[PDB]
Copies of this chain bind each other. A is one copy, B any other.
Amino acid sequence: TSLPLEANAAATLAEWHGLIARRDLSGLPRLLHPDAVFRSPMAHKPYAGAPVVSMILNTVLTVFEDFAYHRQLASADGRSVVLEFSARVGERELKGIDMIRFDDDGRIVDFEVMVRPMSGLQALGEEMGRRLAS
């Protein structure tokens, strides 16, 4: 809520929260830096570029069932946020974080996701690949 973020970063986060709540990530590329990077909980190699990033985030948003945000933590520079969440992928109840870095202008530049436990990560990865057909 009253998180000590930079005005621009706070505005993007507010918009991001609104998209997730509506379970509709269509307006998302507007919030992304053209060269935004996505760091998968599954892979080392990041996904470079706003089109690719928007597509993976939309895929991930459809895979997670019973998605709920919990703790929200901000870095001292007001440009990075960690959004703690709970979710499930089929039978697997998981726990995770959306670690978002914004630039001075409030654009999402880095979006890093981590999931726990192993079983939850496995289920997420399985479904992401199954959905990564078309």
Contacts and interface: CB of A to CB of B under 8 A. Distances in A.
Tally of this chain's copies:
4
Interface string A50-63: 00100110000000
Nearest to A1: B76
Main SS at interface, chain A: mixed
Interface stretch (A8-16, A19-27, A28-36, A119-127): A119-127
Contacts of A2: 76
A23 to B, nearest CB: 21
Nearest to A124: B118
A108 interface: no
A117 B75 CA distance: 23
B45 A130 contact: yes
Contact of A118 (B41, B52, B133): B41
Interface of A: 1-4, 39-45, 47, 52, 55-56, 71-76, 80-82, 84, 93, 95-97, 99, 112-122, 125-126, 128-130, 132-133
